């Protein structure tokens, strides 16, 4: 996929902060709340979903991705995050 | 049908940082290629020793 | 040569803001719009080729897709291979081509010379 390390890190920071991620199907844009291209977000979430760290839905023109337990564990391991922090989905 | 265009692959030049610095036990390390001057940190980056140019790549800048 | 009562001397020693007024409506609007990078690049390349082949021959054939482009006095005498979509037809740019585009001198279809109508050309078949 050949994503820059800072793009990987930003997408993972967002996906872990909010336990969910949304991405328009349009690949040639950049989506808000990120400086990362929608194409890069989609090509990363294909990998996460195939590894099983993300549940993927596609309704009209949008992808909705939901973190899994394996996904929060892997993102902890990757972003080096303490067990103190859990996604905003788990905050309550 | 015409021939196929090759995909460009890097030359795989081994150990370039060695030919970068000439080390002197008499004095100390001499750097063969000039560094590149920029407000963005290019003090460690080197320009290419082109026959007619000096070309910094991290910035994309060329002397003649 | 007398294009609009202005020989090549005046036409080349002119202004593009005055080419605007000597050219027709569509070229004038295309110039009012500030013609683009690829057109300026092709003009630069034509200067290159005319300086490359100067006295004892004709300039080399410069290949372009720019059928969009107007012909101007600065372009007179050059050999431009205009694209159809299949081949680069070489075009020696004369003086009576000014204002027109390059797509008017590169043709995109082979003239139609018909054959036998064959089945289904009527209602008797």
């Amino acid at each position: 996929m050949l994503v820059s390390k800072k793009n990987r890190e930003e997408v993972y920071q967002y996906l872990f902060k909010e336990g969910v991620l949304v991405a328009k199907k349009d690949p040639g844009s950049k989506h808000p709340k990120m400086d990362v291209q929608n194409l890069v977000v989609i090509e990363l979430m294909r990998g996460f979903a195939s590894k099983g760290f993300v549940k993927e839905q596609y309704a009209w023109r949008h992808y909705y991705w939901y973190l899994t337990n394996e996904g929060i564990e892997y993102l902890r391991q990757y972003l080096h995050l303490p067990a103190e922090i859990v996604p905003s989905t788990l905050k309550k | 049908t015409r021939p196929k265009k090759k995909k460009h692959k890097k030359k795989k030049v081994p150990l370039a940082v060695l030919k970068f610095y000439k080390v002197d036990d008499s004095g100390e390390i001499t750097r063969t290629r000039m560094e590149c001057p920029h407000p963005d940190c290019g003090a460690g980056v080197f320009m290419a020793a082109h026959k007619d140019r000096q070309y910094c790549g991290k910035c994309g800048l060329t002397y003649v | 040569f007398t294009y609009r009562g202005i020989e090549l001397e005046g036409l080349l020693d002119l202004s593009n803001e005055e080419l605007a007024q000597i050219l027709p409506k569509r070229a004038r609007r295309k110039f009012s719009r500030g013609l683009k990078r690829k057109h300026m690049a092709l003009l630069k390349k034509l200067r290159r080729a005319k300086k490359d082949a100067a006295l004892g021959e004709k300039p080399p054939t410069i290949k372009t897709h720019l059928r969009n482009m107007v012909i101007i006095p600065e372009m007179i005498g050059s050999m431009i291979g205009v694209y159809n979509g299949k081949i680069f037809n070489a075009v020696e740019i004369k003086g009576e081509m000014v204002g027109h585009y390059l797509g008017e001198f590169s043709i995109t279809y082979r003239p139609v010379k018909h054959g036998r109508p064959g089945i289904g050309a009527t209602h008797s078949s």
Binding site: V20, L21, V22, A59, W60, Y64, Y66, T89 | - | -
Partner: protein
């Protein structure tokens, strides 16, 4: 302002239609029957009506908070602008959709 009345109401309809389509793809294994949208001050409430609220809500509201977040971030809602709710469909036999998906999964 910012929108005609014609365009505001047609856009409300398109918004409801996208909501419904997403939700019927997302909650099909769970008895999703319908959705109501109530634009109220302080909150655009969205009431999901499903057969099995026990599983339209996740492990400790996990799934419904997922859906709330993802709707916020899809439709660009001002934070604290939408709240999703589930409620058992009163009959489950008067819902063609809820029975169509039942027969589907059988």
């Amino acid at each position: 302002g910012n929108l005609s009345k014609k365009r505001k109401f047609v856009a409300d309809g398109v918004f409801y239609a996208e909501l419904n389509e997403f939700l019927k793809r997302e909650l099909a294994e769970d008895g999703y029957s319908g959705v109501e949208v109530r634009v109220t001050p302080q909150r655009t409430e969205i009431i999901i009506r499903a057969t099995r609220t026990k599983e339209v809500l996740g492990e400790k509201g996990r799934r419904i908070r997922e859906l709330t977040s993802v709707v916020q971030k899809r439709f660009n809602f001002p934070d604290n602008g939408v709240e999703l709710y589930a409620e058992r469909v009163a009959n489950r036999g008067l819902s063609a959709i809820a029975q169509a998906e039942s027969l589907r999964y059988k």
